[PDB]
RNA sequence: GGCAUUGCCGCGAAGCUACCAUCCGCUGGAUUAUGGCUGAACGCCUCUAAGUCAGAAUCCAUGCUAGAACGCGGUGAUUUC
C-alpha cells in the first residue's frame, strides 16, 4: 500500500552500547559483544536518547515493512543475548539404548559426540559453534545445556544436535528417540 | 633334401591375446526434495517474507583424456673466411 513511514522501537538498557554504522550493528554489553550485518534490509536507524533507537522504513511495501519488525527483533535479540545471555536446554529421549553424549576434542575443534543412538556403532559428531558453551546438567537427568551470547548460534547448535539424532527407516511416532529442545531461556534471568 | 597350393601329427619360444589371465578405477564444494534455526507479516504462530543450517546416485570442481593445427609462456642455439 506503500506506507509513508513505519517505525519500530529498539530499547537499549544500561551498560549496553549499540553502535550502528551503515547497517552494521555492534552491541556491547556486560556479557561480551555481538555484531550483525543488516545490509540486506534497507532501513534507517536513528538514536533518540541513548536508551532508545528508532528503526524506520520510508515508502515501504508490505514485504518491506514486514522486515522492519524482524530487524527490531534481531537487534533486541542481540541486546538480550549480551545482557541476559541465551540458554537452550535439551533432553535425551530414548526407549532402550541409552544415548551417550560427550564433548570431544578433535584437532582443536570441540565436537559433541553421540554414541549408542539406537544402538548405532556410528559416532554422531556435532561441532560446537564459537560462543556456544556446552555443559551437562548435574541433578537433571540426561540434559545438555547450550549457552552463549548469540540466539542464532545457540539455537542452531541445539538444532544441529537434534537433527543429527533423526531416526531412519522407522515409524518416528513410536521411535521417539533423539535429543530435543525442552527449554529456551536466558542465563541470568529471574 | 624336393613336392603334397602351410602335407599331416606332437611339443613349441617370441609376439598378439582372454572376466579364459592379472592389476587398477580419486575426494572436495554447491544444491534439489526434505527436515530445521532465527523471525516478522498477522503483538500469537510460522523453515521464509529478509537472513540462515543440514542435505540426493544430482551439479560444479579435484582427478582423468585431447590441447585452440589463427590461444599463451619460459628457455637453448642461432649460419662469412
Ligand atoms: Mg518398516
Ligand atoms: Mg596339383
Ligand atoms: Mg614339406
Ligand atoms: Mg574387464
Ligand atoms: Mg520461531
Ligand atoms: Mg527450503
Ligand atoms: Mg529466504
Ligand atoms: Mg549449506
Ligand atoms: Mg579435492
Ligand atoms: Mg597448440
From Swiss-Prot:
Cellular localisation: Cytoplasm
Q: Which GO biological process categories is it annotated with?
A: cytoplasmic translation
Q: What is its main location?
A: cytoplasm
Q: How does it assemble?
A: Component of the large ribosomal subunit (LSU). Mature yeast ribosomes consist of a small (40S) and a large (60S) subunit. The 40S small subunit contains 1 molecule of ribosomal RNA (18S rRNA) and 33 different proteins (encoded by 57 genes). The large 60S subunit contains 3 rRNA molecules (25S, 5.8S and 5S rRNA) and 46 different proteins (encoded by 81 genes). uL6 lines the binding pocket for eukaryotic elongation factor 2 (eEF2).
Q: Any extra detail in the entry?
A: Present with 52400 molecules/cell in log phase SD medium.
A GO cellular component annotation here is: cytosol
Its biological purpose: Component of the ribosome, a large ribonucleoprotein complex responsible for the synthesis of proteins in the cell. The small ribosomal subunit (SSU) binds messenger RNAs (mRNAs) and translates the encoded message by selecting cognate aminoacyl-transfer RNA (tRNA) molecules. The large subunit (LSU) contains the ribosomal catalytic site termed the peptidyl transferase center (PTC), which catalyzes the formation of peptide bonds, thereby polymerizing the amino acids delivered by tRNAs into a polypeptide chain.
Identify the domain of life: Eukaryota
Q: Name one GO molecular function term.
A: rRNA binding
PROSITE patterns the record matches: RIBOSOMAL_L6_2
Q: Which family does it belong to?
A: Belongs to the universal ribosomal protein uL6 family.
Q: What is this protein called?
A: Large ribosomal subunit protein uL6A
Ordered alphabetically, the record's keywords are: Cytoplasm, Ribonucleoprotein, Ribosomal protein
Amino acid at each position: 500500500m506503500k506506507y509513508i513511514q513505519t517505525e519500530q522501537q529498539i530499547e537499549v538498557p544500561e551498560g549496553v552500547t549499540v553502535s550502528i554504522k551503515s547497517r552494521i550493528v555492534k552491541v556491547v554489553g556486560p556479557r561480551g559483544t555481538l555484531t550483525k550485518n543488516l545490509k540486506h534490509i534497507d532501513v534507517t536507524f536513528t538514536k533518540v536518547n541513548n536508551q532508545l533507537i528508532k528503526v524506520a522504513v520510508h515508502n515501504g511495501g508490505r514485504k518491506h515493512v514486514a522486515a522492519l519488525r524482524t530487524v527490531k527483533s534481531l537487534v533486541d535479540n542481540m541486546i538480550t543475548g549480551v545482557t541476559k545471555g541465551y540458554k537452550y536446554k535439551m533432553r535425551y529421549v530414548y526407549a532402550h539404548f541409552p544415548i551417550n553424549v560427550n564433548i570431544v576434542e578433535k584437532d582443536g575443534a570441540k565436537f559433541i559426540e553421540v554414541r549408542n543412538f539406537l544402538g548405532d556403532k556410528k559416532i554422531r559428531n556435532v561441532p560446537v559453534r564459537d560462543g556456544v558453551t556446552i555443559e551437562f546438567s548435574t541433578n537433571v537427568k540426561d540434559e545438555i545445556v547450550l549457552s552463549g551470547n548469540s540466539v542464532e548460534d545457540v539455537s542452531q547448535n541445539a538444532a544441529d544436535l537434534q537433527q543429527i539424532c533423526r531416526v531412519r527407516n522407522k515409524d518416528i511416532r513410536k521411535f521417539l528417540d533423539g535429543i530435543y529442545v525442552s527449554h529456551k531461556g536466558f542465563i541470568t534471568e529471574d
